[PDB]
Symmetry: D2
Subunit: 218 residues, 4 copies
């Protein structure tokens, strides 16, 4: 016995640990992080989400099964009109000018992380893409679950909304869909295939750490 999604989670434990206790993330949980830094983040994360949707697009093209191919398409819609909760909230809450947005550059860390998901999806099958997009969602879910106790973490007039977002029932459903998808796609892969998937999954986990890092370096 061993489900692949649990096995991957197991090997990512340490890294998500560092993420939860990163100055930037702890900064979100106890209101200590300064707006300047968070502003820089949500602009970068916006650029990041545009490239992330493309990996989901890749899922549409590589799914051979209308159910899954359709699930991915909804994912793309969510990424574009659910930030129409989180990211948009903060672009007008801070004041990100419509122009300033599409004037921004992704940082090397940003681009590296999205290129890597994209490239691994393109070189492999639909298992790789299900694997490559998993860290991102899952990690944010644990992170927000964790920050959920301070308390007043949720009460916070500004950072409260972000935490509320990534710990909601929808976000969790979404992560669950991705967990289940990956398990169903893989109950038949060899020891060697699972290794490769595991390698993708930690690698994207590393990029998450690097991302928070460059976000704080702001």
């Amino acid at each position: 016995t061993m489900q692949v999604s649990q096995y991957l989670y197991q090997n990512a434990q340490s890294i998500w640990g560092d993420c939860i206790s990163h100055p930037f993330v702890q900064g979100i949980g106890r209101g200590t992080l300064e707006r300047d830094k968070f502003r820089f983040y949500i602009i970068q994360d916006y650029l990041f989400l545009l490239e992330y949707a493309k990996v989901f697009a890749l899922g549409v093209v590589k799914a051979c099964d209308e159910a899954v191919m359709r699930e991915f398409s909804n994912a793309i819609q969510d990424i574009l009109n659910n930030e129409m909760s989180i990211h948009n909230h903060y672009i007008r809450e801070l004041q990100i000018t419509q122009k300033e947005l599409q004037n921004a550059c992704p940082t090397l860390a940003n681009k590296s992380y999205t290129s890597y998901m994209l490239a691994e999806g393109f070189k492999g099958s639909i298992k790789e893409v299900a694997a490559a997009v998993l860290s991102c969602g899952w990690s944010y879910l644990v992170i927000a679950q964790n920050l959920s106790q301070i308390p007043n973490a949720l009460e916070h007039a500004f950072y409260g909304h972000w935490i509320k977002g990534y710990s909601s029932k929808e976000f969790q459903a979404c992560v669950n869909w991705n967990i289940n998808l990956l398990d169903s796609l893989t109950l038949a892969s060899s020891k060697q295939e699972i290794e490769k998937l595991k390698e993708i999954f930690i690698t994207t986990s590393e990029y998450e750490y690097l991302f928070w890092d460059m976000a704080y370096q702001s």
Copy 2:
């Protein structure tokens, strides 16, 4: 002067001509086509639409511009939940068993046409994909505009709905978006690039004829 979308249309005129006057299509316009044949068609067209959505997915990944990348994503949603007007109407109007559907095989003509759009999109830029998906929509629009006068073509208890569908204001908006997209993407391409686009556009036009053909061969 010459807009590329008009120039492409120009060279496709003859072929769409043959399409409008094809026994299968005329059969739709004057109620003469037998259900058996149409049944076989909507099952094939269903398979075809699944592969077609993937080309739109390709558009998401190849668009570098949030506006267009988002327009493509809506296209994918339409293809999947607008057949939840046309195709679904006829699957329960005829009686296509849920199983029978995903049991069906595409025919060589079907696969050839979708592989070709896919392959040309993948080998080129976002101009090729905007070009590769255009025949399909545009041609159906002219075809339904044409069948729109018989009359009683629209009145027909069975075939009326299909004609109504592809001549509606939404479908036309949709075709227009695709026309405009292509023109804006190309006002800067060389004589040689336009040639290539033209070649894609007639080639897909040919596949449309072949498609009606195999549909009638039913």
Copy 3:
């Protein structure tokens, strides 16, 4: 092994009838017993030339999708072969006939030509490296058997003109090349589900159908 189903053998099984129709096609028969008119064969090798360009691209996809240097390298060689081994077969016949260097890159592929190469491309691009191994196999394997079969008429090989073609696709090099492809596919798939094998089989018969259609249009020349 060997009490265990081999996918290549299973694929081959399901293509049997189609390859039969191919061996006994007017055009192929015509090659085996000198009866086919040069006009038709000219048209053919012009089309086959275009076809071979797009076919290289699928092997190129093999390089990008192979994660393993040995296979990644075997694919690269395959691309080189396709480019400079027609520098046996295709070139032989372009100067043997007289295909002007211009005339070549002036030619259009036919719907059948495009359809076939589009399909291998799209299936490779949508899938993993198993799909590409499966998508390029019909073409090599079937020419192998066809040439093996035409190999007895005899005087099939003796023929001053069509002899070289048959000689080509029955050589030990082409043979080894087809075997590499068979083995590659078997090593990549010894762990795939019933459903995955089905999909690969469906790719194999489809490209087999395109081969028959290809000869057809070559004869329709």
Copy 4:
């Protein structure tokens, strides 16, 4: 031409500062005047070996995206070169040092390694063949200038160990290879909009940034 902006020249302009930082990097300087310790260089050519495998894949993408046999064929040769010209440079140093055949395919690429190759891949796959021509250019061009510069110390070339490396990337072959890439890019782009050129420039500087980061991590060895 030639009162008309050349994109390759414009790209080169914007990479100037970065390539400067590269030439004067501890690691590169270390090569130019024998001071760099073998441990670090060993680590490097192991990483560079992994890197070169993924780099071939981008040229492979060039084959599939080139629509023109000449360029499609030039890319194929580039892949062959990358595989059997390290059969000068990389192989030299694997036996010169002693890299066990196993040790090789046992190595992991580093985040910096992966990031760089992922980026060239993804940008090539998302774009047309102009993007691939642009994505693989930094790497060749910058090593060219670096080797040209290290070419004077002298005794830089004389050095019994590091000499061969410098000799390699300043040869007339590597030179011709970089020129092919420059010319290809200019022919593909003489019709592109301001906005398209910007995107290509952004690809060029980005891969230039990855080069610097690459040397960095090689020295961090």
